Structure formats: C-alpha cells, structure tokens
C-alpha cells in the first residue's frame, strides 16, 4: 500500500551504495508480487535496477547485474539494495517499487531518495530570515537556505501547523557547486505583530535541522 526508502544520500566514488525499503499496508507475502528497485537519473529517463521475491527469485539489469546485489528480508518487511564500484553515472533518485503481474508493471512507487555520487564533502545549510513586499491584507515572508550539499532539504512552517499559502521554490545549483533554495509563506498582515512564524529546515545528509523564527523589520 505504501513504500519508504532509506539510506545514505551521499556516496564517495568507487565505494558501495546501500539502501533499504520498508513496506506498509501489505504483507510482502502474496501470490504473487515481486518487490523491487527502479531509478531515475538527471539528463535521462528511468532505469530498472531490478526486483526480488521470496525465496530468492531475482531479476537484474545487464551491466548493472555485475556490481549489483539485492536481498529480501520477509520477516522484517525490509528489502535491501547494494551497488558496488559506484560511479558518477550512478547519481540518481532511487525508488522502491512493487512489481505486479512474470511481472511487467510497477505500482505503487515509493517517494524516492536522492543519492549523489561525488568526492566532495557534505555541508549543512545556512538559514537566513526574509522579513515581510506586501499585497493588501497579505504579506510574504520566508527563509533563505544557502550553500548546502547534497540534496535535498525539506521545509515546513510552524512544525507543520502552517500549510495554507506555503510555497517552497526549487533549488539552484551554483558555480561553487553548493545548492541554495528559499521557501515563502503568505500570511494575513494583521497577524505579523501577534503571531510568530518559524520555518523548519531539515537536511538529512548532514543530520541538520534548523528552526528559524522570522521577525518583521523595524
């Protein structure tokens, strides 16, 4: 019913990539569903890594097959993907997958986890406030998330209690190679003096969480 992917977001070149998938809403035991991994790469479309089902029936993608190891744990409800001799060509968003039927169609898909393949070091973001630039009865205020690596960051407002009028912009790669993005929320102007707005920035690759309160300039 629902799928989740976990594992490191950064891998150094020539090192092995390990990822785990946890399935909820379904047994991992049924006649017959294979369970699996598919990936998406920048500058190209989807590439099927392959799927495994118990006891040990597996399918592997050619070229990939030599590096690639895949194991299924039925007891935990967890599946694991391993890929060796990782090269920049393996930088990709990896999706957990349920195969259906030998299977030919994939659903549902896990949200996916980014993996960047680089020798560069990890760096948490610097978060700076953007003070409220008004439309009558509505002001925009936000957070600037600068110089982080690698992707992604997530942003919420007031611990998730704010969803109306929230927009988070796509990140920018820079000449430095550090990413930056910003997130903004539209709020009633009358509320600025009485209500406190806090953006919650999460960056899993560096295990950084930053909660920045944004104050109106005086």
């Amino acid at each position: 019913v629902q799928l989740q992917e976990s594992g490191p977001g950064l891998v150094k070149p020539a090192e092995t990539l390990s990822l785990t998938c946890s399935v909820s809403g379904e047994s991992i035991n049924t006649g017959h569903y294979y369970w699996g991994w598919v990936r998406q790469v920048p500058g190209k479309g989807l590439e099927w890594i392959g799927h495994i089902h118990y006891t040990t029936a597996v399918l592997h993608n050619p070229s990939l097959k030599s590096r690639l190891t895949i194991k299924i744990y039925t007891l935990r409800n967890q599946i694991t993907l391993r890929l060796s001799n990782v090269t920049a060509a393996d930088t990709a968003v990896y999706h957990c997958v349920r195969s259906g039927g030998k299977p030919h169609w994939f659903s549902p898909w896990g949200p996916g986890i980014h993996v960047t393949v680089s020798s560069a070091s990890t760096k948490g973001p610097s978060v700076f406030p953007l003070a409220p630039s008004t439309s009558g009865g509505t002001a925009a205020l936000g957070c600037l998330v600068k110089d982080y690596f690698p992707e992604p960051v997530t942003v919420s407002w007031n611990s998730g209690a704010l969803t109306s009028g929230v927009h988070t912009f796509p990140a920018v790669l820079q000449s430095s190679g550090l990413y930056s993005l910003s997130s903004v929320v539209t709020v009633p102007s009358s509320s600025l003096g009485t209500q406190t707005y806090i953006c919650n920035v999460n960056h899993k690759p560096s295990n950084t969480k930053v909660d920045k309160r944004v104050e109106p300039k005086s």
């Binding site: 190209k44 479309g45 989807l46 590439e47 099927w48 392959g50 399918l59 592997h60 993608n61 050619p62 999706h95 259906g100 030998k102 030919h104 169609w105 994939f106 659903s107 549902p108 898909w109 896990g110 949200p111 996916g112 610097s126 700076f128 406030p129 953007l130 003070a131 630039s133 925009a140 936000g142 600037l144 600068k146 927009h167 912009f169 796509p170 990140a171 920018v172 820079q174 000449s175 930056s180 993005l181 910003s182 903004v184 300039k217």
Partner: protein, 212 residues
C-alpha cells in the same frame, strides 16, 4: 532502450498521441506495455499496465494501443493537470524490463498569467557572515518561460547571478527564482539594486536599497 519523442503538445479539450517504438523482441514480441505519469517533483504513477487496460483510479481520457513494434498512448480531452513527463515500459526477454526515454507533454491552449515578483535584500544577520544575497522570487506565471536581469544603479550586473529553470507547481502554474551574490561592501556602495523579470514581452521590476 525504447524510443519515444522528446516532447509533445496539444490544446485543452483536444487529443494528443505519443509513441513508444521497440525491437521485435520488445513490443512486437510480447503483449505487455506499461505507461507511467510523472508530475515534476513527484514519483511516477502507473497509467497503463497492459496495452489496453486501465488501473482503478485512472481516468478514461487515457487510452493505449499497439501496432506491430509501435506502442501509442493517447490522452483525450486535455486538462492542465495532464502536463507532465510520460514514460513507457516493455519486457525485453524473460530477464529484463526496458524503459523509454520519456516524453514531455505540454497542454498548448492555456491562459497567460503574469508573474508575481518578490525581491528581498540581504538580511542583517547575513550581512555579517561577510556575505550578501539578493533574492528574487518569481511565481504563479504561465507560460513557464522568463528572462531575469539584474541592475546595480542603472547599469546591468552579470557576475553574481544564478537563475533556476522554471518548473511546474501544485496550482498548475510555474515558479522560478534568481539570486544575486554580493560582498557587503558593494551592496553598501550603490544607491539601489533592481530585479527585472520579463515574461511574454512584459516586464516587472522590483528595487531594493541598502537604506531600507
């Protein structure tokens, strides 16, 4: 792998067809061809699992067909929602699944929407990191194409600019952002800075000054 066109387009209410071409062993040989929908920033979603057939959620506007080695996906009565990237999948042998390169589908009859531009000066907290960033946020516009130019006083700035490619958003319109990086000194050494966003021959300019 499988071959599909890089892009395709149609008007609202109208029909669009995109194709997936394969080797005798891939599409001509076996019945199974799946089709997937991916909105940007989201995981793909299954639209077809067997060349004709449809999953329980999927709308009837989506239909599949096959002829020899070629597979076709047809979207009938286009909606702004349908604008996205579409992929096709077929079996290569007992041992393999193969994916098409993907097709970018735009709906081509849609109303123009002017961008909303918000410009932010460097925060005080930032300016004593010894850094300075001007932030130009552009939202709620269609078509998804803009030009961004920066001005120091009346003269153009090229050095510090970084600009995103525009991308689709939940409301079905487009957002983009542009950043100008400065040292605190050059920030303080000018009267004002400006962000100009040009969209469909019309421009919006916002200005910020260190004195604010």
């Amino acid at each position: 792998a499988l071959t599909q066109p890089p892009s395709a387009s149609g008007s609202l209410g109208q029909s669009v067809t995109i194709s997936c071409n394969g080797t005798s062993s891939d599409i001509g040989g076996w019945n199974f061809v799946s089709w997937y929908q991916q909105f940007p920033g989201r995981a793909p979603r299954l639209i077809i699992f067997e060349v004709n057939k449809r999953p329980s959620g999927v709308p009837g506007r989506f239909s599949g067909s096959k002829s020899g080695n070629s597979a076709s996906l047809t979207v009938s009565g286009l909606q702004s929602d349908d604008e996205g990237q579409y992929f096709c999948s077929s079996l290569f042998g007992r041992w393999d699944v193969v994916f098409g390169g993907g097709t970018k589908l735009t709906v081509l009859g849609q109303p123009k929407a002017a961008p909303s531009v918000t410009l932010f000066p460097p925060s005080s907290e930032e300016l004593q990191a010894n850094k300075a960033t001007l932030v130009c946020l552009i939202s709620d516009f269609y078509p998804g194409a803009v030009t961004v130019a920066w001005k120091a006083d009346s003269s153009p700035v090229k050095a510090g600019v970084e600009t995103t490619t525009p991308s689709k958003q939940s409301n079905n319109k487009y957002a983009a952002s542009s950043y100008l990086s400065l040292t605190p000194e050059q920030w303080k050494s000018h009267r004002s800075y400006s962000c100009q966003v040009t969209h469909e021959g019309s421009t919006v300019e916002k200005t910020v000054a260190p004195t604010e």
